[PDB]
UniProtKB/Swiss-Prot annotation, chains B, C:
<dbReference type="InterPro" id="IPR013106">
    <property type="entry name" value="Ig_V-set"/>
</dbReference>
<dbReference type="Pfam" id="PF07686">
    <property type="entry name" value="V-set"/>
</dbReference>
<keyword id="KW-0964">Secreted</keyword>
<dbReference type="GO" id="GO:0002250">
    <property type="term" value="P:adaptive immune response"/>
</dbReference>
<dbReference type="InterPro" id="IPR003597">
    <property type="entry name" value="Ig_C1-set"/>
</dbReference>
<keyword id="KW-0472">Membrane</keyword>
<dbReference type="InterPro" id="IPR013783">
    <property type="entry name" value="Ig-like_fold"/>
</dbReference>
<feature type="disulfide bond">
    <location>
        <begin position="138"/>
        <end position="197"/>
    </location>
</feature>
<keyword id="KW-0873">Pyrrolidone carboxylic acid</keyword>
<feature type="region of interest" description="Constant (C) domain">
    <location>
        <begin position="112"/>
        <end position="216"/>
    </location>
</feature>
<comment type="subunit">
    <text>Immunoglobulins are composed of two identical heavy chains and two identical light chains; disulfide-linked.</text>
</comment>
<dbReference type="Pfam" id="PF07654">
    <property type="entry name" value="C1-set"/>
</dbReference>
<feature type="domain" description="Ig-like 2">
    <location>
        <begin position="117"/>
        <end position="211"/>
    </location>
</feature>
<dbReference type="InterPro" id="IPR036179">
    <property type="entry name" value="Ig-like_dom_sf"/>
</dbReference>
<dbReference type="GO" id="GO:0005576">
    <property type="term" value="C:extracellular region"/>
</dbReference>
<dbReference type="GO" id="GO:0019814">
    <property type="term" value="C:immunoglobulin complex"/>
</dbReference>
<comment type="function">
    <text>Immunoglobulins, also known as antibodies, are membrane-bound or secreted glycoproteins produced by B lymphocytes. In the recognition phase of humoral immunity, the membrane-bound immunoglobulins serve as receptors which, upon binding of a specific antigen, trigger the clonal expansion and differentiation of B lymphocytes into immunoglobulins-secreting plasma cells. Secreted immunoglobulins mediate the effector phase of humoral immunity, which results in the elimination of bound antigens.</text>
</comment>
Amino acid sequence: QXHXX
Amino acid sequence: PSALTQPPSASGSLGQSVTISCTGTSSDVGGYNYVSWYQQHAGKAPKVIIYEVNKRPSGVPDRFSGSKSGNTASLTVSGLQAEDEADYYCSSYEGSDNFVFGTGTKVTVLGQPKANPTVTLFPPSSEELQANKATLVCLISDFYPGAVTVAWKADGSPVKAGVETTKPSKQSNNKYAASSYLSLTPEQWKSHRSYSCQVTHEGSTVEKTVAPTECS
Amino acid sequence: PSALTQPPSASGSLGQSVTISCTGTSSDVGGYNYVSWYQQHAGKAPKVIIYEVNKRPSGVPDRFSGSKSGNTASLTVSGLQAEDEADYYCSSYEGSDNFVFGTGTKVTVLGQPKANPTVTLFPPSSEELQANKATLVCLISDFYPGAVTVAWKADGSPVKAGVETTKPSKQSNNKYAASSYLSLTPEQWKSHRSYSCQVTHEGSTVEKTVAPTECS
């Protein structure tokens, strides 16, 4: 997913 | 902290469903709207099926939903295809460049039909034969369920030795595949009338035979 | 698409520094540094041990390292520890909506001598042919660790089609057997020239080729 800030 | 509460198994059937929870705290599940869910088939590549709320990455199967409720997030699979039966994980943000993963769940369809294995037996290769190696293989394809029992045979008088069998792998569907070898020499091979791989599946027995004949 | 190619087996002794590369392609070539490295032991959901190519989350033992240029990100395990045996993955964000995964490097803290794979290709017999059935079988025996790759070429042209590969299975000598199989049609097998079983085991790659002949 990693995702995201 | 905990293994993010995740049920350890979920069932269903052809065109039934199941809905699964990613359960943790207000630090992570509660906190940020980003709940990612994984589709990872038996031991292989985890796959992103959904990533924030219900955000399926353009090209994702089925009535695959994700609804976040409280500290609980949840995925929905309405279209119990066999194609699922997997280890479905979740994960959310934790802040400080931290992500914690859900713990459980291996999804199980019921209804799934029985499939009797197509046994394809392979005489030794000529190239291998020229190498002075004689190896016989018994292929087992297609079979559902997953337990398969194999036997090798000379001229009866069962005959084991130098025999291997592999433990069934899922495939192009939740249909399984196994194999089996006989590492023989030409002398063990080429003397006999035939050899024979006898395979069993839920009572039913196949038998597959080979005679030193080969054609090509 | 999962364009992040990874080495199968990666292995070492307690002490030496096993590396795990991961390659891919296109778009902003290596213009995304969203490379994330994940460990997973056989029963767990995947721990994230690295990210943003060079970054470890809170804690993560400073013996796990990251690196990346052009098309290759890498994870060096600088001083293998016993409990470093696990599955390892790469991950890259193709853009927004997109997440690409690796093939996985099963890393093994070597118990045995590292055993290089015995591969043997068999073509569809006269009889199977007589049955309007075409199957080829690439028995892969004797490797250690049980972590291999299999690619099928038709006239050197890597076909992505009808084929399966068993899981590697600890034989009665603790060496791993597998099976990749290919399912053809006597038209397509006749209408071709050559059929390669290209098998690879970290730092090696075999290709045994079978050619269509006749007799009958």
